[PDB]
Amino acid sequence: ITALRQQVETLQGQVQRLQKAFSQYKKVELFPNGRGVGEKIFKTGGFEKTFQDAQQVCTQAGGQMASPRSETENEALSQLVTAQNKAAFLSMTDIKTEGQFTYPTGEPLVYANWAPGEPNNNGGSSGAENCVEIFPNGKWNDKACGELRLVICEF
Amino acid sequence: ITALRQQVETLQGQVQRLQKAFSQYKKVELFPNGRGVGEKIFKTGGFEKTFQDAQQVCTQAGGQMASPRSETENEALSQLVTAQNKAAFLSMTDIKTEGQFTYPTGEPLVYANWAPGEPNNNGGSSGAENCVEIFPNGKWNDKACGELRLVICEF
Amino acid sequence: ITALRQQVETLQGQVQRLQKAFSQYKKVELFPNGRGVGEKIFKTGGFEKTFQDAQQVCTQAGGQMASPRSETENEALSQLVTAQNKAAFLSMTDIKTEGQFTYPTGEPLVYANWAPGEPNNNGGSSGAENCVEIFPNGKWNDKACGELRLVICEF
Numbered sequence A, B, C: 001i002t003a004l005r006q007q008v009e010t011l012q013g014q015v016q017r018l019q020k021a022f023s024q025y026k027k028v029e030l031f032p033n034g035r036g037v038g039e040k041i042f043k044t045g046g047f048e049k050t051f052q053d054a055q056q057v058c059t060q061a062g063g064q065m066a067s068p069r070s071e072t073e074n075e076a077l078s079q080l081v082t083a084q085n086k087a088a089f090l091s092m093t094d095i096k097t098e099g100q101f102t103y104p105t106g107e108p109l110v111y112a113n114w115a116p117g118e119p120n121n122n123g124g125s126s127g128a129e130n131c132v133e134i135f136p137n138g139k140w141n142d143k144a145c146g147e148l149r150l151v152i153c154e155f
């Protein structure tokens, strides 16, 4: 029918405006504590927690901790860490097998950006160092999971 | 026609992607200062104001102060109060009739979570206590409306 | 066909709910650091940077610095500056031609709200004053671009 055609063209307009409005509100939301990379979105809570606290926080929020699988994804996190001037915990650990860092899924790294001479598993008073922190410069450093670091969740 | 069918199937795809993208951006927005319960959304501004200031703030923002009508809704607020480590004002008062706390609409409570021995209307120097604050543990305490408390708005 | 009609009516419902949900999530996002005026959206990052830093920040985020072209737009910014209690940089400068303040595009002001006796180009130790800051009261004051001021981006 011809009226059905009218309803469809109306929907096209409505959908177009929804798309425009949403694109704008994506940018607004991400400023300043969020970064979009691919279909991923990293966002910092602005606070610091231990690794396991941060892991619960991100999960409770409906996401997970950041698993940067590329340089572009790693760069985004670097920007958040820089803006906050606080090193942040990544999602990876080598708790299962020492020396081998893994994603929460069980699969080994497909990307890495260790700083000079890392990891080393030397946390001093803290003891072992099974988690990973990322610096403002984007470099990685294994660190005692019990330390407090910037919380960044991946959605 | 057959072309109209094509336009419709195109809209289905567009709408599906809008839905997926929006679900993701809902989670992103709510982290970390927001909680979704039913069709309600609680969000903290992170700051503290008197009851009447908080009431103007929430209204100006297009919402209202939190009227937790269930344990699930009350729990959500508890999580926000805990994260901020700041007690927050609820929307209810007994200003009209002493002893009887009411929603901004005029209707009496359909849910309550008073702490041991509350309310008591004893604010000391503050005087009377006609408003309600909620603790990190989720318990309620009547308090002088003139006090500064965490602002949480309901949308 | 009749089934196509069913799919279309289904889309209408889906779109209606998307619209409702989005309207709600617009209000949530804007609280408390955002203001909507027309098709524009102002949002503060909460931090302070020099004019050129703020300009990079806003651009990187996919927007620009605030170009208030009316009293309603200026009022919105005033509300953000007030809430933060921090004067903010606007997008306008007179760097090209002294005395004549311009938008980033190259066009002269279509609106202005200078405070008593401004601008004056007297920044003391700072030197010249080619940028513009806005006070909680909404009034404008030219200021050394090298100063640190509240960052507010326009999307």
Ligand SMILES: OC[C@H]1O[C@@H](O)[C@@H](O)[C@@H](O)[C@@H]1O
Pocket: A120, A122, A123, A124, A129, A141, A142, A143, A144
């Ligand atoms: O506090 C322990 C940390 O000390 C830093 O200076 C580095 O040496 C890191 O490798 C180490 O994890």
Ligand SMILES: OC[C@H]1O[C@@H](O)[C@@H](O)[C@@H](O)[C@@H]1O
Pocket: B120, B122, B123, B124, B129, B141, B142, B143, B144
């Ligand atoms: O400051 C007054 C408050 O003091 C607290 O210790 C409690 O006793 C509350 O009941 C009371 O509202």
Ligand SMILES: OC[C@H]1O[C@@H](O)[C@@H](O)[C@@H](O)[C@@H]1O
Pocket: C120, C122, C123, C124, C129, C141, C142, C143, C144
């Ligand atoms: O610090 C310089 C500033 O000092 C303020 O008191 C005002 O006089 C401004 O006009 C001037 O830009």
Ligand SMILES: [Ca+2]
Pocket: A094, A098, A099, A119, A121, A128, A129, A130, A131, A142
């Ligand atoms: Ca180790």
Ligand SMILES: [Ca+2]
Pocket: A118, A119, A120, A121, A122, A123, A129, A141, A142, A143
């Ligand atoms: Ca180390």
Ligand SMILES: [Ca+2]
Pocket: B094, B098, B099, B119, B121, B128, B129, B130, B131, B142
């Ligand atoms: Ca009372």
Ligand SMILES: [Ca+2]
Pocket: B118, B119, B120, B121, B122, B123, B129, B141, B142, B143
């Ligand atoms: Ca009391």
Ligand SMILES: [Ca+2]
Pocket: C094, C098, C099, C119, C121, C128, C129, C130, C131, C142
């Ligand atoms: Ca000047």
Ligand SMILES: [Ca+2]
Pocket: C118, C119, C120, C121, C122, C123, C129, C141, C142, C143
């Ligand atoms: Ca001046």
